[PDB]
Design a protein around this ligand. Structure first.
Ligand SMILES: CN1CC[C@H](c2c(O)cc(O)c3c(=O)cc(-c4ccccc4Cl)oc23)[C@H](O)C1
Lengths: 301, 251
């Protein structure tokens, strides 16, 4: 019965297909009833919500409205009837492509995928934001071959005053060593660790470190990255979780799948243990991997 | 982008006007809702920023909705509840309701938290927060004149006193005027410095070029406006009992 000039009813879009199942909610492909424009409709979840509109959804919406970039997913508007987030539709997700055995990646297409992804991280970090949920399923690609960073549900703003940020972030497999060691004072480097895992994934087709618990993950990380000692990671022992489990070489394990040497080299500077020594978005975009033949090419496979 | 800025003619033709409410009554209802926000805000121990955000939500809400259908005493608590979540100081729904109650019915008694009466007035606040969100089109990120005040009080090497008077003007513009609906935060901040200066008898030194202190804050601002705005702000401050007293030099 009430006027609502700036929140249109989602009935303006016509659902076509429920494309996303999981615990993130329900994602629908839809079609603008007048123009045919395709969109993604992501309903805001209200399971056990006893504090009104979910504070986490406000955060996510706040961040999406701020992040406006060719390689970050695009919130068009927010709709009602219950509440829907409406995005420009992206037909593919990197997880689904990586699994379809009929899909093939030329190296110059891999270069372009990693380039668009790294450019997206450069952007969100410049805007003082951490993604905190890096993984294949959150990298999307449009019909026209433009990669979009998506799902900012765990995302959070950062800055630089000792930081009091939350520890249980990032799905186990893409979670970086810091977080496993119980870190609470971190920033952008955690997302680049994920980018490293995703990059390797472009050749292996499978997430490369499939841990079962936090300690079996840390273990799997050691059997690829070396042990976690103050010789490799100064002052790592300053943390009260180096206790267990202790233990005492990345290019080797990936030789078979990844042929390009520049590619292997970049993967090794992303999957570094010490965050202070981990390569950043800027220096990664400048790595010779992106500036040697074959050059990055547009996506059509 | 120009969505929440209105001409003086649009401020005149408000939704509350279409339903009878006079221009001076409407200004009053906003001042009352601001007071209610400041009162609940101080008792809930949230910051002046959270409150200012609440006040701007309220202001914009009544450029779309009318005071005759949405009473400020119902809207303000819900606006504050939302602003606290947006601004990082979440307060619990029950807590905001208890505090709204004691502010509005000082003598009444906290209803039985198990009654069908109370359960309903909780649902009413959750319904209003949803109505506020939709009315604002989910645009909850607010820029305040304060942000820009520090920027141009170092630009006049003003004492700590001149600066604190400027924030006071800033906060009071939100309560007492509708500048937040007409002028960008950077402009409102100039108006606030300009008047804090007039009030403190602090005179600003001419820049090295010949240009004035405000030019380095918003290109649109002209002295002709600054004087019209500081005069309007000053008049309302004079009508507000005990306010000027707070920044008045008693020595
Ligand atoms: C975990 N997750 C990944 C991101 C996803 C998501 C977004 O957050 C935002 C979007 O615009 C999309 C989109 O357009 C298409 C798809 C999509 C595409 C293909 C297969 C499966 C999916 Cl879920 O997902 C989108 C959703 O948050 C759930």
């Amino acid at each position: 019965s009430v006027e609502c000039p700036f929140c249109d009813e989602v009935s303006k879009y016509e659902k076509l297909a429920k494309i996303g199942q999981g615990t993130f909610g329900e994602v629908f492909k839809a079609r603008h009833r007048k123009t045919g424009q395709k969109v993604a409709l992501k309903k805001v979840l209200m399971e056990n919500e006893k504090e009104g509109f979910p504070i986490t959804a406000l955060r996510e919406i706040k961040i999406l409205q701020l992040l406006k970039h060719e390689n970050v997913v695009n919130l068009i508007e927010i709709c009602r009837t219950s509440i829907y987030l409406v995005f420009d539709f992206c037909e593919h997700d990197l997880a689904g492509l990586l699994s379809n055995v009929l899909v093939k990646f030329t190296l110059s297409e891999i270069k372009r995928v990693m380039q668009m992804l790294l450019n997206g991280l450069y952007y969100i970090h410049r805007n003082k934001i951490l993604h905190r949920d890096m993984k294949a399923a959150n990298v999307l690609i449009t019909r026209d071959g433009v990669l979009k960073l998506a799902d900012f549900g765990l995302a959070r703003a950062f800055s630089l005053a000792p930081n009091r940020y939350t520890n249980r972030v990032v799905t186990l497999w893409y979670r970086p060593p810091e977080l496993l060691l119980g870190e609470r004072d971190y920033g952008p480097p955690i997302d680049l660790w994920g980018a490293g895992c995703i990059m390797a994934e472009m050749w292996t087709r499978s997430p490369i470190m499939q841990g079962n618990t936090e300690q079996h993950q840390l273990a799997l990380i050691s059997q690829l990255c070396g042990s976690i000692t103050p010789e490799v990671w100064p002052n790592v022992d300053n943390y009260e979780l180096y206790e267990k489990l202790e233990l005492v070489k990345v290019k080797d394990r990936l030789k078979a799948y990844v042929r390009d040497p520049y590619a292997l080299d970049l993967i090794d500077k992303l999957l570094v243990l010490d965050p202070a020594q981990r390569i950043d978005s800027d220096d990664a975009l400048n790595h010779d991997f992106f500036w040697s033949d074959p050059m990055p090419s547009d996506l059509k496979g | 982008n120009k969505r929440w800025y209105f001409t003086r003619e649009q401020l005149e033709n408000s939704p509350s006007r279409r339903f009878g409410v006079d221009p001076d009554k409407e200004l009053s209802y906003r001042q009352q809702a601001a007071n209610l926000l400041q009162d609940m805000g101080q008792r809930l121990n949230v910051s002046q920023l959270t409150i200012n955000t609440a006040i701007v939500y309220m202001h914009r809400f009544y450029m779309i909705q009318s005071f005759t259908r949405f009473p400020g005493n119902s809207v303000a608590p819900a606006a504050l509840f939302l602003a606290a979540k947006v601004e990082g100081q979440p307060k619990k729904l029950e807590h905001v309701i208890k505090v709204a109650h004691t502010c509005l019915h000082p003598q009444e008694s906290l209803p039985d938290t198990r009654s069908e009466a109370y359960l309903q007035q909780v649902q009413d606040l959750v319904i209003l927060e949803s109505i506020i969100l939709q009315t604002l089109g989910f645009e909850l990120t607010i820029d305040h004149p304060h942000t820009h005040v520090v920027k141009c009080t170092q630009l006049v090497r003003a004492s700590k006193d001149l600066a604190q008077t400027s924030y006071f003007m800033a906060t009071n513009s939100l309560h007492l005027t509708t500048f937040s609906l007409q002028y960008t935060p950077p402009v409102v901040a100039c108006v606030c410095i300009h008047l804090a200066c007039k009030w403190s008898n602090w005179e600003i030194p001419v820049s090295t070029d010949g240009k004035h202190w405000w030019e380095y804050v918003d290109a649109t601002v002209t002295l002709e406006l600054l004087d019209e705005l500081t005069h309007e702000l000053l008049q309302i401050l004079e009508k507000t009992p005990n306010r000027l007293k707070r920044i008045w030099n008693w020595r």
